[PDB]
């Protein structure tokens, strides 16, 4: 039974045009002037875009013997209600390198996904087991490996481990991701701040100022380039890390950057709210920054030095945040934004002219699809693509509120944002997944998306590195 989306205006990363869309067997069958189908969906007056891909989520993430509050069920509901049809989550193995066991456990979690998903595999140590299982992980359809330069004593790896891992990535045709903050300096700053009685939520930001992110970003870049592999920097929050990426790209290094919607539109003044709960709720890493940083990130999206908007979705209830009363290091880090990502970006970015509608599509789905090597299966409006689509009414308005959010927690860091232009229908592989304010996709409707290694940028870089490889001088006896 086919669907035809009629009367809409298609917006993709490359063009905007009036067209009908015929959907058969979960895929786009045809795009053209007048199409017929068994079931008609009216998109008159609306835009039709690829469903959003959010490459950065932490659904049901383990914390202190419990979990974050949004799991793959409520998380994907929030995603769908915001026009996002795919999430990419981070698998977190132990330092022993039980990558495959951790993967199995994340598959169990993701069984509740209401829409399609994939994984990044984190690397939280280095040893022979880790080295071997990375090969198998790539065979299972995961082509990215996430590294933490912070979280000393938990997730952190050092330069030595990171270089070996990046080289293994290069070898497998995978691409490293990095959380770039200097973990040694943050740990000492945390301890010093706590020792001085500087223990409130605002001190979380004090313990990891922008220079600490800027440095680690620069270092991760050096190591990836030495290893001959592209690098993806997650949650680029400030001018210091953005500058490191621009400078690397101008040297011809292959580096991608991902600003969070939070860092595009929220700022550190939130931590100076007189209410402890209010300030603690906004604690995440990297923290909200000086507002001046926002323009840098926006300009990067427009200039192409930053490519993907994400949310780092990790939602905790007020009760969970309160674990850090009297100690900011015990406030669970994370704010949720899955539902808010595309709508906030549309109002703040497209309606203001900071982004063309086409750039909007590029930085919400198409770019990350290309970067993770699943374009055009995802992030595309072309025949043969998965029919993951959002129907966007440019005229509808709302005020963001915790009272109406699909996320399970009791607050919303975008509380009060005035929006115009909203997702009114979301389709996941041709199925109506969100409609008339209701999430219609059921838990288990989502499936794992396998990804192939050795994307175009990996291959070009490897070829170039071979060209410029330094050679031994031939010397007579």
């Amino acid at each position: 039974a086919s669907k035809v989306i009629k009367g809409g205006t298609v917006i993709t990363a490359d063009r905007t045009f009036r067209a009908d869309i015929l959907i058969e067997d979960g895929k786009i069958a045809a795009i053209g002037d007048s199409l017929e189908g068994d079931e008609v969906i009216d998109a008159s007056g609306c835009y039709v875009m690829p469903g959003g891909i959010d490459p950065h989520t932490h659904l049901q993430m383990p914390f202190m013997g419990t979990y974050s509050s949004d799991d793959f069920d409520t998380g994907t509901a929030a995603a769908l209600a915001g026009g996002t049809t795919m999430v990419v989550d981070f698998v977190l193995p132990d330092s022993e390198g039980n990558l495959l066991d951790a993967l199995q456990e994340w598959f169990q979690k993701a069984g509740k996904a209401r829409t399609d998903y994939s994984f990044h595999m984190a690397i939280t140590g280095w040893n022979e087991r880790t080295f071997n299982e990375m090969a198998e992980v790539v065979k299972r359809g995961i082509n990215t490996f996430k590294h933490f330069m912070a979280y000393k004593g938990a997730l952190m790896v050092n330069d030595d481990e990171m270089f070996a891992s990046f080289q293994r990535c290069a070898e497998l045709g995978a691409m490293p991701l990095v959380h770039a903050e200097n973990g040694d300096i943050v740990a000492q700053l945390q301890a010093k701040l706590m020792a001085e009685g500087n223990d409130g939520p605002e001190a979380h930001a004090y313990s990891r100022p922008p220079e600490v992110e800027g440095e680690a970003t620069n270092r991760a870049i050096m190591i990836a380039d030495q290893a001959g592999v592209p690098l993806y920097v997650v949650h680029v929050s400030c001018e210091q890390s953005h500058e490191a990426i621009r400078r690397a790209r101008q040297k011809g290094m292959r580096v991608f950057g991902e600003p969070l919607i939070q860092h595009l539109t929220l700022d550190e003044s939130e931590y100076h709210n007189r209410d402890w709960d209010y300030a603690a709720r906004r604690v995440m890493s990297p923290p909200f920054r000086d507002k001046l940083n926002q323009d840098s990130l926006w300009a990067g999206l427009a200039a192409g030095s930053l490519q993907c908007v994400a949310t780092d979705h990790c939602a905790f209830t007020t009760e969970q945040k309160r674990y850090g009363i009297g100690n900011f290091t015990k406030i669970p880090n994370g704010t949720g934004g899955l539902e808010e990502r595309m709508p906030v970006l549309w109002t703040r970015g497209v309606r203001t002219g900071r982004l063309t509608p086409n750039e909007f599509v590029a930085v919400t789905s198409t770019n990350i699809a290309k970067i993770l090597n699943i374009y055009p299966q995802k992030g595309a409006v072309v025949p043969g693509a998965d029919a993951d689509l959002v129907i966007w009414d440019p005229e509808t308005t709302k005020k963001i509120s915790a009272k109406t959010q699909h996320s399970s927690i009791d607050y919303n860091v975008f509380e009060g944002f005035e929006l115009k232009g909203l997702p009114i229908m979301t389709l996941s592989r041709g199925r109506i997944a969100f409609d008339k304010g209701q999430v219609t996709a059921k838990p288990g409707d989502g499936r794992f998306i396998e990804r192939e290694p050795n994307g175009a940028v990996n291959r070009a870089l490897s070829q170039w590195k071979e060209i410029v490889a330094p050679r031994k001088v031939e010397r007579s006896a």
Copy 2:
């Protein structure tokens, strides 16, 4: 009578995939797994790409009562043999502002074109007539206006004129192009050099060092941004001008940059060749630069801070170059590259891994088509696009030589370049235009391509300027 291109691998700016291409009525009718057509073109083992678009040509350009040696006939022949299916030439009006008259004169020239073409309209003065005829020029399908900051006493405009013209561009939804060298400093350096007996071809480069281009680029950007209109900088030849563009883009300014294939692969040491003819042949503006500048331009293409490769094709005979014997200011400026642009870029860029094949397509056709607002009619492999296509054999080799070039002049500045990967067939709106080393397109086969004003980037920028427009302070009596 339809054509089907079978067995090939399609490369576009966004993806690479095996597919057949059905062509009907000069357009791409279908793209898919197995297609049939009246006539079969075998593309087994080959890549199929959008035909190149070269936005920077000067065919049959007036110089000293004569003309450049390549006209629209030989010019488009060379283009087609090099996989380029469209050229964009510059109409050069008198300073009185006889834009429409100049346009008619250029249509007469382009009657000989063998493949499709369009125009930029130059603005060489400022007055009421110019202001008025700009509106009429836009109605006739030209949405770009070219400005010269150098060539004092002939083409040059000042800051005042340039600002007025840019504001008019903003109003009409057109985009200014700029030749950015400081004309006043250049004229004085020329005169000082001649007065000192420094009168050889190498002194042309001396008379306009990179700082002179860097300054003018920076100034034109300021003025475009103040007028609220995007800016396209032609022939970005050096790091100083590239740096100005990167810095502007990081401020959120809408600026495009165009490196010439000459400046990517050739350098100023050519001017120090002992043979006068050899050095003079290479004289153009901006001149060939210190070789160190090339890596900057290549990185710009990979990073997206530069978007389009062109040739500034303006070919003169050795006899014409010799008009400047004893006086370098009288050496006609220009080198030809229409045929060599895509082949040299492929060998130097794709085969080395500096550019992915998709980036190659982006910077040889798709980007400029989008920028000139003619995507997807041109620069696309999508249904409904003009069937302007090149069939590329990645294994064929040749050495570039004047003896085999299609340009009418007696030398080739890319002489001796070893290539691998060549255009073996070129189609212009579904017609075989180049095949088996022969240009099969006839003079008059080319048609003028009209362009609409107010593309997406123009619209976004105007919207943004309105939002940040400074407001009067309300003061009570």
Copy 3:
């Protein structure tokens, strides 16, 4: 009759040390542990620094058939009360190039000076007379020529004229100064804002945003470097112009930058004050900028990418400012800061640790003395130097107020600034010029300081340009 300053701590651009200073015949005769002299000045608990040099003033400047309200009398009074012992003013000739005639008129103005002074010569056009008279100006002891890239129809020169003039500067061993704003773009923005009814004081700032200054700074640098002459950019107000200077210097170009004390400590929010008078009073060029720019300028001073703090002192009464009611282009541009420069810089810069005390001396006197080629006659505490000195009590406090200022106008843009550490005595060539809150130097006490052309940086740059000069290829 000798003077000895006893018990103080000397602070110079290069060091800090306890020493007595013996003054004879208007000069520093000796510096050492224990000295005696005919007359004793007690500097116990105080710092002794070279008197400030403000390289940027416009005293009795011609405007609209009148003049600015602070002349060389009240202006040097203000300077002295702020620890500044020398001003450098701008001679403004007509565009016909009557440089010598204008110079004579400025000598008449400066007859009222209470402390020493020198001149910059502005170049407001280009022609044979201008080219010729520049040589004679250099012979008269002025080794700097000021160029305006803004003020279209009045002071402005174009790239062609500026290049010719800069080449003439190089030839004479002079150094160009530049007011860098794009005059063509500013004139058009002014007209547009006025046509749109955007006619308040705030639109003055709107008519010349930072990008316009950044561009012109960048262009002027290119032209000086092509001419092979060092360049001095006056009133670097924003990160865009500062960036152009840093980038140029890293290319090995010889460029100096001068942030005004206003742009270090005041910002554009002043223009949005609801009171029209309040906002109009702060109108100057370049305008007060977004506060974010302050950090860039401060860092430049500490890093050495900016070398001299000045005031661009050009004072108008409220009545004069009101000439621009309903039309911001008619508000006379300028604020006064002569008295406030060193004291504000001390509190905001030294007491905060943004500048070491030695850096404070460098950016208020020694650097500009060196740049204008009058070191160590001025800006120094060495034997043989002019005894131009300020005795600074680091503990005394005050709140800046128009009620206590020596400037003749009725307001103070630094109103309410809380200070600690103040000039308590100022000496000009050994004469007590400021003491007990009173200016004791008389009008006419000031003397013209002549300057030699061809300073060290001019000579080094010329030598280098000769080394790297492009040569003809020898062809049979």
Copy 4:
């Protein structure tokens, strides 16, 4: 017995002027138009400048159970013959942190010094002993601590150790120095190149390309600025590390940079010379770089973003260099330049107009004197200063050659440099220490120069950090959960 230097032209960092100089009791007694003294030294037609200060030497440095070949005797002879009157060497303790024991050993080495000297104290690990002895090291008159980010398994410290040490420096009013190369990445590149048979001298440069230095520079700066202490980056060899310093200074961070005379005038093409010995002799860390980097360093000296020229003097014989035949990682790292520093800089920098003569004085003595807090005792021509002076004949010429050098090794990486303008006499505390090509100062004539902590820049930075220190938000119980 007084000396008067007559007829010369004084050049200092701040001015150039004709003056006589009267010297009494090892110090400058007076400067003026015509002075009289017991013994007259004729400086007619010559310049008189502060004697050079080279803040970066490794004389008789321990390596592989032996030592580098220039000790404090021949090292200081070389210095003096090049117009340099003071060297600053690096004390190298074991990782256990036996700083005082190491200091005593270095005093034994420096007993042979012919001209004055001082020390930097290296920190090669972190622990309680190290923390404690740093305080005593500062009390002995050493106010700098050197950190190595490279030389893994030998001298290297990590970010954690470096941050603790930088904070201790801040506390004591000391200033850290850093050798900034990423040691972990260098060690892995070394192993990779060796495994691939890329084992020649040129592969030394391959194993630590400029990005590896630029990264570590950027990192050391971040850490120093977080600790609230100024940082001195030794041997800034390339644009990447130079850019990191410029960017940091523009953020208002207090960072100094030191380009070596080698990196200003020599380049990596030397490693591709066909002769193994020739290439290996030039091996040092950081290696000679792409020639393009030179202009960046020269501009930094002229712009003030780099402040001091040094040599990293560490001299090995050809026989010692040959320890690395078949394995570039075993080639002892270091080249000598003590004698060549000021003369090469004068010809390449002053005679070309890249530096004014005054800037030449700044970057060869006065800046480092100020930075190490011993101005005006050293690096100055003012009354009361130590009479450490060089008399410079701007017209005399020579070509640098191993056959005439005062360094003890058998080659010279500045071989063939054509010079004009040379020191013809060097005075150390008023004693003629070098004259007419002869080193006249004897071993033991040099004395240790004590330095005080808490220089002006340290104090200003600490004050600024206090001003901008982030404060706890005051929250009433009304606003608490």
